[PDB]
């Protein structure tokens, strides 16, 4: 495996990789972690 890896460079064609959300005043980080990585993977695993 490389010494350094950055998904944002590896998959520049997936704009969600660089995006930062805001959970606001709510303990929803459990969901954000999820939909953020899900967004990313849809883009990665799709043609």
């Amino acid at each position: 495996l490389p010494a350094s890896f950055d998904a944002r460079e590896q998959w520049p064609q997936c704009p969600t990789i660089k995006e930062i959300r805001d959970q606001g005043s709510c303990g929803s980080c459990w969901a954000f972690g999820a939909v953020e990585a899900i967004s990313d993977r849809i883009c990665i695993h799709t043609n």
Binding site: F5, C26, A34, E36, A37, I38, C43
Partner: protein, 205 residues
């Protein structure tokens, strides 16, 4: 094909299996939910992007900026199985599903391989007081009392000053940390960062 998967849909329609909405929940069950019930598109607060955009406004998370400061925890919005007006098609036709979901091993290399092979994962670590002030560099807990567990997105890795780290995305907007990102010590299961990694493969359909 990039879709902005709705956090709102996940936060509100997952019942008690996910935990308790705004009062925290279970990352692993969130992945499972996507496998069983799938998830619609939905962008940022008041973006009008997708079916179910986030309805809780942004704030200032332990920093100073224009936005009002984050209050603490509020109300979990309601599960409404309909898209915002102006969006086409139907809620149900906008659902995106998972093929599977699984826990990744508490092992640096397993976690490295997974990201490299399938993309960003979700992890969680205990947050201590000194973390809030994160600006830049590699985070290492030294001082401060504990606050809780905090789920995040791990999307890479590196070494800085011979200090290896995990590249993570926080969800405290962009004016927190390093444009919204942070780096934390890797290979030492630091603050439990390699302990609750979960991921899954989308459904090419």
């Amino acid at each position: 094909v990039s879709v902005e998967v709705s956090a709102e849909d996940l936060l509100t329609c997952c019942g008690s299996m996910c935990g308790d909405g705004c009062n925290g929940g279970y990352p692993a069950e969130a992945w499972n939910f996507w496998t069983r019930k799938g998830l619609v598109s939905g962008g940022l607060y008041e973006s009008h992007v997708g079916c179910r955009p986030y309805s809780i406004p942004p704030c200032e998370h332990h920093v100073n900026g224009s936005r009002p400061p984050c209050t603490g925890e509020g109300d979990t919005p309601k599960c409404s199985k309909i898209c915002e007006p102006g969006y086409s098609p139907t809620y149900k036709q906008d659902k995106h599903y998972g093929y599977n979901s699984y826990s990744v091993s508490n092992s640096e290399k397993d976690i490295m391989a997974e990201i490299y092979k399938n993309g960003p994962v979700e992890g969680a670590f205990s947050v201590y007081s000194d973390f809030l002030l994160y600006k830049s560099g590699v985070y290492q807990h030294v001082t401060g009392e504990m606050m809780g567990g905090h789920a995040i997105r791990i999307l890479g890795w590196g070494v800085e000053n011979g200090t290896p780290y995990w590249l993570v995305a926080n969800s405290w907007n962009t004016d927190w940390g390093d444009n919204g990102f942070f780096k934390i010590l890797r290979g030492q299961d630091h603050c439990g960062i390699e302990s609750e990694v979960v991921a899954g493969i989308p459904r090419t359909d």
